[PDB]
A = this chain, B = another copy of it.
Amino acid sequence: GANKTVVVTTILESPYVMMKKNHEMLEGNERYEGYCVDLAAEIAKHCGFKYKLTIVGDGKYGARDADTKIWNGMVGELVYGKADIAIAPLTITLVREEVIDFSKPFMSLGISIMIKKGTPIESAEDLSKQTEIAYGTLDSGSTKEFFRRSKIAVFDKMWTYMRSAEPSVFVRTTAEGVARVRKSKGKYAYLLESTMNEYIEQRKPCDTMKVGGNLDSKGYGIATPKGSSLGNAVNLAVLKLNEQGLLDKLKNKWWYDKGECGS
């Protein structure tokens, strides 16, 4: 049939997609900025489609409710036919891969530790061997799952603590985790993806730090409905853009050129 505008679903997560400060004055795709806004433009160019950016209606990434079996978030919008492509920091996982198609990674990352500067923690082992400093993860996401699935003693000890800690150590969003680190006076550490951690470390008030190495190695992928004809071209575009350096150019633009914490 005739071509139609492609509906892109994405999520407000800095610096991937942000409302421009003057968005009330703008319309359409021009309302948004960030790494994934720039990536969407490049993918559309390299696949030859016109597109409309939309923010996922429920504000969520995508998980399946254990009781109703309904997918929420961006994954749900793809699964149920409400969007054509998701361009966001959507971690490639087994459970999602079974229901949607993913490009090869456009960004690589791993689980990492965020502290308020001066917190006496250098490693996951340090967290696991003390109790004064609480620590947790995003409540719905791949970081929590790493701990749930681990057979490594340190990470098992961490999961046993986190899963039962009161008050809850799990947070609703990255912004909530960061705020909790910043406001808990060194008594909360946040486990999150290295990409977000490294971004926040270069944001005012410049009071957080990434500590230690990454605990694993994963990727973000562009997602399409399973079997969608768009997936092949999107995947080729990701590889081509990576090979020509464009993805690293965008990362440097949004993480470091725009850093607020010095050079």
Binding site for B on A (CB under 8 A): 92-94, 97-98, 102, 104-105, 107-108, 145-146, 149-152, 216-219, 221, 235-236, 239-240, 242-245, 247-248
Contacts and interface: CB of A to CB of B under 8 A. Distances in A.
How often does this chain occur in the complex, in copies? 2
A212 to B, nearest CB: 15
**Interface majority SS on A: helix, strand, loop or mixed?**
mixed
Contact of A108 (B108, B151, B239, B243): B108
Contact of A104 (B104, B149, B242): B104
22 contacts: A92-B104, A94-B236, A94-B243, A97-B104, A97-B235, A97-B236, A97-B239, A98-B236, A102-B104, A104-B219, A104-B221, A105-B217, A105-B219, A107-B217, A108-B108, A108-B219, A145-B243, A149-B243, A149-B245, A150-B244, A150-B245, A218-B242
Contacts of A145: 243
Contacts of A221: 104
Contacts of A248: 216-217
What 8 A-B pairs come out closest when comparing CB atoms? Answer: A94-B239, A108-B217, A108-B108, A149-B244, A94-B240, A149-B243, A150-B245, A92-B104
Nearest to A104: B92
Nearest to A92: B104
Most buried by B among A102, A217, A218: A217
A94 B103 CA distance: 12
Given A93-B239, A97-B239, A151 B244 contact: yes
Contacts of A146: 243
Given A92-B239, A97-B104, A236-B94, A245 B216 contact: yes
A104 B218 CA distance: 10
A241 to B, nearest CB: 10
A218 B236 CA distance: 14
A208 to B, nearest CB: 21
Contacts of A97: 104, 235-236, 239
Contacts of A236: 94, 97-98
Contacts of A216: 242, 245, 248
